[PDB]
Amino acid sequence: LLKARQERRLAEINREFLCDQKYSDEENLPEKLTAFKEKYMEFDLNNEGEIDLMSLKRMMEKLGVPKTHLEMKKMISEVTGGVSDTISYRDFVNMMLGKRSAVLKLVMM
Ligand SMILES: [Zn+2]
Ligand SMILES: [Zn+2]
Numbered sequence: 001l002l003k004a005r006q007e008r009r010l011a012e013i014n015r016e017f018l019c020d021q022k023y024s025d026e027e028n029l030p031e032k033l034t035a036f037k038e039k040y041m042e043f044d045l046n047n048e049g050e051i052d053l054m055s056l057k058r059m060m061e062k063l064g065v066p067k068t069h070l071e072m073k074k075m076i077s078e079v080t081g082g083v084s085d086t087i088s089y090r091d092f093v094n095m096m097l098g099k100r101s102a103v104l105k106l107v108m109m
Contacts, residue, residue, distance in 0.1 A: 003041065006049055010037045013089050026097060036096050039108065040089055050086035051076075056104075065107055075103045 014033040023029055043059055046052045051059075053072055060067045067075065079087050079095045079102050087095075087104075095102050 006045060007037075007041060009049065010040065010089055017093060023093075023097060032097070033093070036093050037089075039096075040092050046086060048086075050088045051092070052086040056087075060107075063107065071103075075107075078102050079104055 014037055017023060017033055018029060026032060040051070043051045044055045046055060053076070056072050056076065057067075060072070076085065076087055080091045084091070095105050098105075
């Protein structure tokens with residue numbers, strides 16, 4: 001019942017993202033955030049609730065996509081601007097909505 005607590009917190013974060021000025025130009029934000037929340041939760045999150053190297057690795061093996069230690073560390077820092085070793089839901093939403101196309105995003109679709 002951890003993944004229900006994780007869902008609820010992301011649901012609340014979406015309530016914030018629905019009003020954040022940063023995304024107020026987005027059309028169909030409710031359906032976008034719902035889609036992003038669903039996708040983020042497909043990852044085995046660490047226990048702050050962020051995607052770390054381990055979760056990224058497990059997703060890569062899930063998707064049948066080969067990535068090296070260093071390609072993965074770079075996929076993360078590309079998405080977090082080098083600020084952090086893990087991808088938070090915020091960074092994940094910024095990636096999904098950004099026009100810059102990160103390797104992690106390309107790998108999703
Ligand atoms: Zn609209
Ligand atoms: Zn709608």
